[model samples]
Structure formats: structure tokens, C-alpha cells
Target: DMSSTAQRLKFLDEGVEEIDIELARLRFESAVETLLDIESQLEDLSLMLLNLISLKIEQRREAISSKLSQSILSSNEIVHLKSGTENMIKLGLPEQALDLFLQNRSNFIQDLILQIVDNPTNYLTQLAVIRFQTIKKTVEDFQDIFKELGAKISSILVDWCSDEVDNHFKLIDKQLLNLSPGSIKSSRKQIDGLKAVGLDFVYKLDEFIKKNSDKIR
Candidate 1:
């Protein structure tokens, strides 16, 4: 039973990751086919897994709440660091960006822990969208800074953004093991409300990245 549940959870997590990737790809470019493929895979995953983890730990609800609190605190720090990173990138400060990213990596993991405690499915989706949008914005801001630098430096900035995205995603996967099922269930409308805003932000960020990639890179 444990193995079966683990497999099911893994499958569900993959679907969530695919959605995030597809959304990022689509927003960054005209990649409809790839997005569709991810959507198809998402459809195949068991919806029941959404509630599985929560059910398993229903008795330990207080522990979940404590974890959620920790996550929120960690996310607060991430937001602060991300803001600083963006400013540095906009000022043509690649070194500063690198420093901020490295310094805040642990905080990001802590935030992810909180998210998992609250609601694994939604947390994963939200975190993905947050990273996707932040990276997109970071690229745009960095491009503007690159204009002050020469063409070669600007090209490096573009490369840095790409590498940063890859690195963050790897970190996300590593930190994702903390996610367990959450007991909270809201109406479909509520869940959709949250997702819609996140997806919209991701879409806008993708557009911004695509529009300015050439000038910045």
C-alpha cells in the first residue's frame, strides 16, 4: 500500500511539474504542442492523489499547521531577497544577483516546506508559478541593465537568467520531498481563483521575456 501510494503521489507530482514547464514554455514562446502534451499527461494522473497525503496525516493536523507557519515565514524572506536580486540585476549587477540567489536558497526551501504542509498540490503549483514569473521578470530587468553594459555583457546576462531558471528548478525538486497531503479543501471556484491569478502572472511574464530576449541577450 505504501509503495502504491508513493507511486501515485509521484505520478501526480510529475503532472504538476509538467504543467509548470508547459506554462513557462508557452509564455516564453509559441509552444502550443508541448503545452498540450503536458496537459494530456496531467489528465492521466489520478485526481484522488490530491487528497491522499492530507488523509494520511489527518491526525497530525497541528503539525501541518506549524509547518505551514514556517513556510510562510521563509517565503517572506524569499520575497525580500528576490526583490533585492531584481534591483541588482536591473542595475547591471550580476554578481549581486548571484550572491542573493545563493544566500536565499535555503530560505526558499523552508518556504517550500511550509507550502507542502498547507496543501501539497496547490503549494507545488503556486511555487512553480511564482518561480516562473520571478525568473521572467528578472530576465527583463536584467536586460535593461545590460543596455548600460556592452553587447557581450548583455549576452551574458541572458545566459545567466537561463541558468538561474534551471538551477532554481533543480532546487525545487530537491526540496519537494517535504510535501505531504493537506487536509484543507476549498470549493473548486476558490481553487480556480487562486490558479487563475497565478497563471495570468506566469503568462504575462512569459510575454515580457520573449519580447525583450533579443535586445537584452
Candidate 2:
């Protein structure tokens, strides 16, 4: 019994050292495999050993999770995004990865919307059209990336689309109210254009939602 306990203790130390080496070398895939392997071994080990090794495993897991998140946000390419998301899911962090990934896309869309300058004749109609088109394309890409999540992710997409419609109308109403009274004809044209584009955006988004109704719960 004593000899076997000592052997287990030595094995635990060696396993931990190996994990440290793998992590330091940025060999994350192998490091994760090692962590899981050691975790399974700990189940049959002594109570004190379990406590010691469990803490190390959890710490390394968190480090790996954060690293994956950084890569996901930094690259934003589909391949990296998919791989990072999968790694997070494998680490039992599905929610965190999903939240981060979706938030990144939302911020990206909002930034693109901000860069739109008003056209001379259409006012913000061009902006609105571009915004809606970008959103539709983004939804397509997001669905392709996370289709495995099914309604869990698609429902969030639909809700976000709903909110975007509401938000667009509110902004249009505010712009109409704030227009200068000196140029009634010009402001009227701009206001009409804004109103028309708002409807267009809503209808386009509605059509997209209906088309994907089977996927969105």
C-alpha cells in the first residue's frame, strides 16, 4: 500500500510537470488531452491528491479558455472562429464562447453602420439599405457557423433582428423631429426617404425571418 501510494504521488507530479511544459510551449491541444487524461486518473486516486490536482486542472482549463477567446476576437476569420468556439465548447464553456462570439459580431455590425455617410438625395436611405443588407448577409454567415446549435443561436438572431427594426424606427423618428425648419422642402424629402427606407428595412428583415422560420424557434 505504501509503495503504491508513493508511485501514485510521483505519477501525479510528473503529470503536472508535463502539463506545465505543454502549456508553456503553447501546445494547447496536447495540453488539453493531458489535462483530461490526468483528470480521469485522479478519480481513482487519494482524496488529497484529487484536491491538489483538481485545482491545477481547473486553472489550466481557464487559461486555455481565455487564450481561445483572445484568438477568436483577434482573428475573426471563420476558421479561427469555428476552431476557437469548438475548443471552448470542449472545455465546457459553450455559453462563454457563444456570448463572446455573438457580441463580437454585433459590435462589428454597429461599427459598419456608423461609417455610413448620408447621400445627397436619399439622406439616410442608402445608409439604411446598406445596414439591412449587411445584417442579412451576417445572419446567413452566423447561421452557417453555428447551425449545429440550431434554435439556441437562431432564436437569438431573430430577437436581435427584431430589436434592430425597433431601433431603426426610433432613430428615424428622432431625425424627423430634429430636422431644421428653415429648409422645409429638403427636410420633407429627407424625412420621406427615411420613412420609406425604414419600411424597406423592416420588410426585408421580415422576409429573411420567414424564410428561416423553420430554424428559428
Candidate 3:
């Protein structure tokens, strides 16, 4: 409080500078802490100075928090998730953090499924096997990290799996039920080829559901 007006102003500005640096480095937790300390110290400021300082600090905090949320949403992996979630909680936005994380993983699984379907050489059985195994691993990874969320997370996983199963059946319907009348008679060989490996895929999917039955609600 004894310091000159110029020095006091510079001190607040210095904290803002540190925040900018930390935000640029993706050190959101550190940036948040610095912002909090600066706010806490603002009580000693003159009314005129305090008004300006408060406005500046609020804008900085909002920008930093938005950037933090983007980091979690944009990531292809979970490496930044834990820390990013914590910082989001610190910034008073736990809900946004969780929402972003869940969306990120859902998109990841969608991309994997698309890749599986894109390859022309894969049989229905191969598609089901790959899809089941990949989904199992992803569920395990999600459960291991987000177990504290309890049944809410479990329910989301269950919904995701059911949707996947539904999509698998749709694939079968298009490949088998939608076959033209002429193809069924003239192209009996192709229909026979489909039969050689049919239903087995459905059996595998049934097994997948059964394996995780206890976890589903």
C-alpha cells in the first residue's frame, strides 16, 4: 500500500502478463492460480484503480477458461483430460468439462466405426469382431479413468453399445434383406457366399452384449 501509484499499477499488469504466458504454454492450472492471487490482492487498490483491474482480470479469466475448454474438446486422446478437467473445476465449470470429454470420446468411436466399414475386403464377421474388440477396450479405458462418475457414466456406455448393436443390424438388413429379386435367383452364388459367414456375426455381437451384461442397466 505504501508503494507509488505507478508501481501498484505495474504490479497488477505484471500478473496479467504472467497469465498470458501461462495460458500460451497451455498451463491453465498455473494461470488460474495466478489470476486468483491477483484478485485476492485487489482489495487494497484505490476505487478507480480497482474498477479497471477487476474488469481486466475478469476478461482474462474468461478467455483462459474458454481456451482450457477447447483443449479438452479438440484432443484426440485422453492425455490432457485429467488435468484439464481439474482446471475446469477450478475455473467453476465442471459441467462443461465433463460434457466436452464425453463428446470427444463419442466422436473418436464414430471415426473408428467409419474406418471399419470403409474397407471393402472385410467380411461381416471381420467387421463385427473388430468393432466388438475395439469397443470393449474403449469401455475399459473409460471405466478405469472415470469410475467416480458411477452409474451415470455406466448408463452412457450402455446407450453407446446399444446404438452400435442397432447399427450392426442395419448393416445386415441392407446387405441381405434389400437384395434385388433378380440377384437372389441369378446370383445365387453371391447369396451363398454371404450365407457362408452370416449369423455368426450376430452371434458374436450377442456374446459381446452378454459379456458386458452385468455392467449394463
Candidate 4:
């Protein structure tokens, strides 16, 4: 690819390809799916924690055992210690962290739960290497949108270019036909007059260029 400046470089230019749109759309869809999954887990975790509080209220105020207290995770004696929340992201399981908070029933669990609820980012920061991958994907969605917009602009420009080639340039040429270069072919009597007009046009065009050349550059 080096030392190729003097040669013609041929390839694709501007346009919208369905395959590319599909690719970017698929990426957007996948990133959104991930966010949906995380949100779903977040909702589930919140419900479970709220159930735990309700379970406690039932045990103290009412005599009956709450539904969650009879759940599987609570049924057995605390088999694991801090392994529950400490390795929360390691296991990639939210319920494990939830179990940790549920069983021990102390300031430890409460504070940890609050820490996660208050600022999930702090907890996610620990798993930065893994979490950032998802963040990076989400960020790439912007480029997808940008290219999609550029493709649309290209489509619009193609139409404009065609319109000018068909009408605007032809209209300019039609007007130019009154000049010596064009009118000379039709009217021999007007030849001298047309040449005078043509000469005037060139002289005026040259002067205009002289005045505006610095600004143009």
C-alpha cells in the first residue's frame, strides 16, 4: 500500500449497503440485549432483597414463616461464608451475592447490599476488565449511527448530483448558447455582436477572479 500516491486507488466510495447497516444494527441489538439482561437481573435482585425484608417483618410481627424464609437458599444451614458477595462478579451470579446478604443477617450484609444499591458502578469497577468490554460495545453504537447517517447523506447527494447534471448544467449551457462560441453556429449576422459579448464576459470573469482569488484560496 506504500508509495501508491502516483497510482490510481480504486475502491468503494460513499453509499449505504444493507449488509453494513445489518452489521451495525446487529451490534446495536447485541449491546442492547446485554443492557436488557443486566437490567432484568437488577430488577430481580431488587425484588429478592425486598422479599427478604418482608420475610423478616413477617417472622418478628407475625408468627408464620414467610415464603422466602422457606426458600431453598434459606432452607439449609449457612454452608458458605463471605464467598457469597465477596466473589459476586467472579461467579457472574447476582443470586449468589443475594444469598450472602440474606443468610448472615448482620451489618456486614446490610452495608454490602447498600453499597451495591447505592452505587452499582463502585462494585462494577472492581470487575473493570470484564465490564469495560460491554461499555466499549455500547460506545461503538454511536459510530454505527454516524455511518448510517453518512450513508443517508450520500444517497441525498447522489440525487442532487443527478438533478444538476440533467437540468442545471443544461440550463447554463442553454444560456451560454447566446455567446459567440454557441451563437456563431446559428447567426452569422450576430457573429460580431456575439463575439463582443463573449469577449466582455471573459474580461469580467477574469477581473472577478482577480478580486476574489485571495479569498478563494
Q: Give candidate 3 regions above 4 Å deviation.
A: 1-10, 43-46, 117-217
lDDT of 3 by residue, 1-217 (tens): 4658657777887887789889988788899888888887776564666687778899898988788788877776566766676677667665566566666665665576667433322545554554455445555655555556657645665566556556654665555432223322222332233233221234433554454444334
Model 2, which residues run further than 4 Å from truth? 1-28, 44-46, 120-126, 150-154, 179-217
Q: What is the lDDT of residue 137 in candidate 4?
A: 30
Residue 18 miss distance in model 3 (angstroms):
1.5
Give per-residue CA lDDT, model 1, range 79-151, as digits (tens): 5544444434433345545444443543443454455424555654565555545545444544443345566
TM-score of 4: 0.15
Most accurate candidate by lDDT: 3
Worst 10 residues of 4 by lDDT: 7-16
| Candidate 2 lDDT tens digits, 1-217 | 4677657766876787787788678666677677777777776674566587678777876777778788667655666777776666666666677677766666666676676635332644554555455456556656565557766665676666556655554554455543222333432343344343232343543454454444334
- Compare candidates 1 and 2 on lDDT and give the better one: 2
Full candidate order by lDDT, most accurate first: 3, 2, 1, 4
TM-score (C-alpha, index-matched) for candidate 1: 0.30
TM-score of 2: 0.63
**Total backbone clashes of model 2?**
0
Model 4 clash pairs?
Answer: none
Q: What is the TM-score of each candidate against the true structure?
A: 0.30, 0.63, 0.56, 0.15
In candidate 3, clashing pairs total 0
Q: What is candidate 4's lDDT per residue for 1-217, written digit by digit as tens?
A: 4433112111111111222342245332232333334334334444343454334332322211121222323322232323222223222333433433333333222333344312333332322222222223322422332233345443443333233223322432444333222222222222223233121122322443354444333
